[PDB]
Design a binder for these strands. Structure first.
Ligand SMILES: Nc1ncnc2c1ncn2[C@H]1C[C@H](O)[C@@H](COP(=O)(O)O)O1
Ligand SMILES: NC(=O)CN1C(=O)CCC1=O
Ligand SMILES: NC(=O)CN1C(=O)CCC1=O
Lengths: 28, 19, 27, 17
DNA sequence: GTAGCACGTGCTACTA
DNA sequence: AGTAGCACGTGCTACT
């Protein structure tokens, strides 16, 4: 029920942290 | 939006770094 | 604890601030 | 970091432009 | 019913 | 030993 939401937010944080890592890779 | 902000700078860094 | 919490609130805010400075730089 | 990344990016963009 | 957000914690990591 | 930094859990508005 709500653990479904906590697990879904875990994927969203993983997505943001992915975008952080991508942006960092593009800057020397 | 934080996702949109990251995407933008990332897409503009990549473009502008290839000129 | 409250002191800990207080710093993180202020540290988050500096992250957001750093997020709005980056959106304002790119056209 | 995160903050490092935003500054670096903000400052890299500020110089290329 | 999901996406974006910010908060309150606890854990590791770095600072004088 | 305090202060950063990170990720989780979680209870919000708001959109599509
Ligand atoms: N666009 C959209 N998608 C999904 N759920 C929505 C939307 N707009 C409002 N709601 C809310 C309104 C109800 O409380 C709830 C029912 O599902 O969804
Ligand atoms: N990582 C990328 O460059 C591809 N991408 C995303 O994931 C969001 C916006 C965009 O252009
Ligand atoms: N407004 C600014 O000073 C730009 N800036 C900082 O001060 C730290 C690095 C960064 O992004």
């Amino acid at each position: 029920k709500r653990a479904h939401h906590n697990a879904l937010e875990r994927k969203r944080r993983d997505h943001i942290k992915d975008s952080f890592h991508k942006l960092r890779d593009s800057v020397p | 939006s934080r996702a949109q902000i990251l995407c933008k700078a990332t897409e503009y860094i990549q473009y502008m770094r290839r000129k």
